[PDB]
């Protein structure tokens, strides 16, 4: 779904870094896709993907399928994955994550 | 101190994809660089260069600059990273790491 606004190759090496079960790093992967040096406007259009139901926040099963939104056969993330950027991107602990806590997952 | 036992691109590469602070992973790291694929005795090895006070042990300040063992320049881990890594490896809790946990670290 970023295929157009996130370059090609960027998104090739993001996944290809972490191929292996248990490698991701949301910091690793928001460098690499070059989400980092997006205006918070483009942050927000982002958020809206990975918010597959458009329910206003990125609930664990979303977190799950996170690279599937750069590349549809991207693997789900493992649960210590998934379990470790809940916690590092949700700020007020509701188990969710808001758009501004993505923001700042995103770019801090 | 690789640089002979891992290869050259392999390592460029795996530095390149942690450079930014905070993007550290350690299986990312571990399968990039090549030790994943390694013997037990090539870990040892391995092991034997990160204890750089041959302690029997990887203390937390060799932790620390865990990188550097691959290439000189390279940068430090935060102490975030190396808690993070510390904590993966470390399962007996007395804060270091020995051989076996390393091994498991880096096969498993």
Same mark, same amino acid.
């Given at each position: 779904?970023?295929?157009?606004?996130?370059?090609?190759?960027?998104?090739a090496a993001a996944l290809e870094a972490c191929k292996a079960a248990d490698?991701?790093?949301?910091?690793?992967?928001?460098?690499?896709?070059?989400?980092?040096?997006?205006? +918070? =406007?483009?942050?927000?259009? +982002?958020?809206?993907?990975?918010?597959?139901?458009?329910?206003?926040?990125?609930?664990?099963?979303?977190?799950?399928?996170?690279?599937?939104?750069?590349?549809? =056969?991207?693997?789900?993330?493992?649960?210590?994955?998934?379990?470790?950027?809940?916690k590092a991107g949700d700020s007020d602990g509701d188990g969710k994550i808001?758009?501004?806590?993505?923001?700042?997952?995103?770019?801090?």
């Amino acid at each position: 779904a970023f295929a157009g606004v996130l370059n090609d190759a960027d998104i090739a090496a993001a996944l290809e870094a972490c191929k292996a079960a248990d490698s991701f790093n949301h910091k690793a992967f928001f460098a690499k896709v070059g989400l980092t040096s997006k205006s +918070a =406007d483009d942050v927000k259009k +982002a958020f809206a993907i990975i918010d597959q139901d458009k329910s206003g926040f990125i609930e664990e099963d979303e977190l799950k399928l996170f690279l599937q939104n750069f590349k549809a =056969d991207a693997r789900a993330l493992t649960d210590g994955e998934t379990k470790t950027f809940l916690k590092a991107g949700d700020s007020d602990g509701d188990g969710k994550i808001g758009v501004d806590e993505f923001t700042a997952l995103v770019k801090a």
